[PDB]
C-alpha cells in the first residue's frame, strides 16, 4: 500500500543533457500521506530542486555535470513508486 | 557542511580480495539531504554500487580485480567523513 498509487513523468525520467536541468513531475493524490524523496545515482553529483505546488502535485528538476548512465529514483515512504528507478542516459551538450 | 555526522563501517573498509565483492555500509539518517561520493584508488578499476533499501540503511559494494593497496574515500557534500580515506589491503584469490 501507499507507493504503488503514485505516478511520475517528465523528460527528466527518460533522458538528459550534461549541465542542463532535467525536469519531471510527481503526482501523489490517491496515495496515503507521508514523504516523497528523490535520489540520483551515477558518475556525478546531482543538484535537485524540489517544489510542492498547491495542486497535490509535485515538480522536480535536477542538474548533473557528467555524460554517462544514471538512475533516478522516486520513493514514497522509503519505497519505489512504479517504474522507480528510471534508467536515464546523459549525453554531452550539443 | 554536515559530513561529520556520517559514519561508515564494515569488512569492505578493512580488507578485500580480488574478484570478490566487498561490502560496507554508511549511516546517513543523522545528516539529512545531501550527496555521497565514493572513490576507490589503486592498481585497477572498481565496480561500485549502492544498495539503498527499505530499512533506510545504505550499503556499498565494490569489486576490484587486482591485488594491492587501494584507498576508499567516502565524502558527504565534498567533505571527508570521519576516518576517510580508508586503507584497504586487497589480497590474492
Amino acid at each position: 500500500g501507499g507507493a504503488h498509487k503514485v505516478r511520475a513523468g517528465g523528460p527528466g525520467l527518460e533522458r538528459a543533457e550534461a549541465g542542463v536541468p532535467a525536469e519531471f513531475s510527481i503526482w501523489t493524490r490517491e496515495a496515503g500521506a507521508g514523504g516523497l524523496a528523490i535520489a540520483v545515482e551515477g558518475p556525478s553529483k546531482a543538484e535537485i530542486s524540489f517544489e510542492d505546488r498547491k495542486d497535490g502535485s509535485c515538480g522536480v528538476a535536477y542538474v548533473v555535470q557528467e555524460p554517462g548512465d544514471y538512475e533516478v529514483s522516486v520513493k514514497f515512504n522509503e519505497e519505489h513508486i512504479p517504474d522507480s528507478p528510471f534508467v536515464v542516459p546523459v549525453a554531452s551538450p550539443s | 557542511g554536515g559530513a561529520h555526522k556520517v559514519r561508515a563501517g564494515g569488512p569492505g573498509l578493512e580488507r578485500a580480495e580480488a574478484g570478490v565483492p566487498a561490502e560496507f555500509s554508511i549511516w546517513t539518517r543523522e545528516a539529512g539531504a545531501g550527496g555521497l561520493a565514493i572513490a576507490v584508488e589503486g592498481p585497477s578499476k572498481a565496480e561500485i554500487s549502492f544498495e539503498d533499501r527499505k530499512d533506510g540503511s545504505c550499503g556499498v559494494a565494490y569489486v576490484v580485480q587486482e591485488p594491492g593497496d587501494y584507498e576508499v574515500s567516502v565524502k558527504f557534500n565534498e567533505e571527508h567523513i570521519p576516518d576517510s580515506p580508508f586503507v584497504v589491503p586487497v589480497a590474492s584469490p
Binding site: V40, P43, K45, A46 | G35, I38, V40, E41
Partner: peptide, 18 residues
C-alpha cells in the same frame, strides 16, 4: 620516469529532504 599512476573509480548518490 617519476610519476605515480593509479586508477580512480567513482560513484555518487545524491538524494532529497522529506
Amino acid at each position: 620516469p617519476l610519476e605515480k599512476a593509479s586508477v580512480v573509480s567513482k560513484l555518487f548518490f545524491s538524494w532529497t529532504a522529506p
